[PDB]
């Protein structure tokens with residue numbers, strides 16, 4: 150219906166709107182994660198900083214998707230944003246496990262959208278995702294995996310010590 | 322219950338959580354406003370820019386409230402974020418009228434929270450709002466009022482012309 | 494037949510030659526558009542400048558295709574270049590409508606070539622188009638759509654006024 | 666009685682003198698805390714530095730109150746300064762617990778003085794405290810709470826190790 154729209158299916162348009170919702174939900178989750186680690190009874194500033202930076206990145210990803218939706222002549226449609234899955238996030242290990250589950254869900258949504266684009270013979274969409282999302286997700290997931298491994302080696306028989314040291318010597 | 326909490330009522334803690342929700346909702350609204358004016362069939366870049374900057378400011382306000390909630394020993398609780406009130410925002414005049422209604426609602430929430438703080442004899446809260454929110458809101462509302470007046474004078478018998486000129490000569 | 498040629502079909506080679514012709518034709522069209530707006534009885538310097546810059550870009554696109562044809566071991570074959578579809582281009586609105594029709598035809602040719610490359614399992618070709626042509630076309634088409642919307646809002650009941658203002662305040 | 670005094674009650678004047686005494690007492694306490702951590706058999710330089718900086722800050726707060734007392738036309742009256750509550754301060758955990766108790770007592774005195782000012786309709790006093798004391802106290806108390814949480818997580822089954830690491834990696 151737009152004057153500019155060309156080779157942009159309704160199915161891809163809708164799936165992009167849904168992916169915007171998922172990225173904004175993920176940003177909201179990271180916001181909650183960050184402020185949890187800033188509580189005086191949690192107090193891990195490098196962990197807070199790690200998650201607040203991811204909140205920014207996910208919002209930015211949403212904004213990139215929205216810009217692309219308008220460049221293609223689709224129409225942004227916003228839905229309610231559900232609250233994060235928890236109010237309290239446990240230990241740094243617990244939080245990093247929730248983070249990697251969240252990133253793998255975003256990655257799967259990206260892969261699903263790429264498959265849809267491929268089925269709809271939409272190369273601009275496929276290039277867009279390849280260029281700005283797929284590698285960024287793989288790199289982040291790798292980094293979170295590396296963090297989980299280091300967190301876990303640090304538990305030992307002194308879990309508090311290990312949590313402090315990881316925050317001080319990796320994250321800060 | 323926190324080790325740090327002192328003179329911070331449950332009523333203020335809850336009202337701060339609700340105000341965070343209102344600011345994040347307002348940011349979401351501004352996000353939608355901005356991307357609407359970036360549509361190829363709307364195409365008012367200075368209007369898009371105006372609203373995207375307000376989306377940033379409202380998110381920042383939420384983050385300031387959350388930081389203060391943790392400094393006082395309260396506990397951030399996030400709720401679902403409702404979607405904006407419209408999907409399409411009309412003319413620049415329509416959008417600026419919706420914006421001033423939104424800002425007056427935030428201002429009222431701030432005034433209500435200040436009244437609660439006063440009733441609870443919570444001077445740190447009152448100072449916080451005075452210092453970082455109340456003047457910012459008055460200044461913004463004044464600016465939006467000035468814009469509405471200029472938009473309206475520009476309608477005349479050539480509404481398209483006036484909309485272009487306001488975007489070009491005030492907003493851009 | 495070249496010593497270097499590998500995985501480069503005859504069908505893709507021919508289609509690249511045809512796309513070079515289309516890009517050079519488009520450059521020629523933009524040349525004519527630009528010099529039309531430089532006529533003393535048309536006299537819209539920002540419109541002339543807009544189209545002369547597109548003439549350059551389209552020639553550059555042709556040259557990129559030719560460089561790629563030789564990198565793959567294909568052989569450039571040039572055909573006659575037909576003259577542009579008009580001698581006189583009307584108003585800025587008329588000209589911008591002809592421009593977006595032209596860009597959508599180039600975009601379709603790019604999409605058709607990408608589909609051919611996909612059918613011929615030629616990933617270097619697909620990457621080439623994705624990297625240097627497909628996004629450039631979407632961005633240009635979006636920009637032209639934005640311009641058409643602004644031009645149209647400016648017609649009103651004073652078409653000459655609107656044409657001057659768009660040239661002065663958007664294009665120049 | 667001063668030529669300048671206006672809207673400055675006797676009750677506020679006396680309460681300001683008492684608050685000067687409390688701030689100077691707090692500085693003295695921090696002096697003792699700092700020199701304790703500089704003992705050769707305690708030897709935690711980052712802890713010493715933390716407390717010596719607080720000794721400076723509390724003296725500065727006293728001096729600000731005295732300057733304000735003279736700006737309002739009140740009259741500074743000094744009393745004996747009692748010695749700190751302990752001669753030896755234990756572990757870093759013990760010392761940080763004593764510090765937060767001390768800061769909460771200063772904060773309460775500030776809140777009490779603000780309430781008195783409010784009852785006496787003395788807005789200059791209320792502004793003074795809001796501007797230079799109330800937020801500074803909340804921020805400090807938050808920081809001490811964060812430190813206590815980190816100190817406690819570090820005790821584990823190796824209290825000496827944890828005390829060294831906190832001094833090295835947070836305080837120094």
Ligand SMILES: [Cl-]
Pocket residue numbers: 157158159160
């Ligand atoms: Cl479709």
Ligand SMILES: [Cl-]
Pocket residue numbers: 194198
């Ligand atoms: Cl920070």
Ligand SMILES: [Cl-]
Pocket residue numbers: 231232401
């Ligand atoms: Cl939910």
Ligand SMILES: [Cl-]
Pocket residue numbers: 329330331332
């Ligand atoms: Cl309460």
Ligand SMILES: [Cl-]
Pocket residue numbers: 366370
């Ligand atoms: Cl922009």
Ligand SMILES: [Cl-]
Pocket residue numbers: 229403404
């Ligand atoms: Cl709703």
Ligand SMILES: [Cl-]
Pocket residue numbers: 501502503504
């Ligand atoms: Cl072949």
Ligand SMILES: [Cl-]
Pocket residue numbers: 538542
């Ligand atoms: Cl020129």
Ligand SMILES: [Cl-]
Pocket residue numbers: 575576
């Ligand atoms: Cl011809």
Ligand SMILES: [Cl-]
Pocket residue numbers: 673674675676
């Ligand atoms: Cl009096």
Ligand SMILES: [Cl-]
Pocket residue numbers: 710714
């Ligand atoms: Cl030193």
Ligand SMILES: [Cl-]
Pocket residue numbers: 747748
């Ligand atoms: Cl004593």
Ligand SMILES: [Pt+2]
Pocket residue numbers: 197198
């Ligand atoms: Pt940070």
Ligand SMILES: [Pt+2]
Pocket residue numbers: 198202
């Ligand atoms: Pt960082």
Ligand SMILES: [Pt+2]
Pocket residue numbers: 263267275276
């Ligand atoms: Pt693909």
Ligand SMILES: [Pt+2]
Pocket residue numbers: 280281628
């Ligand atoms: Pt890109």
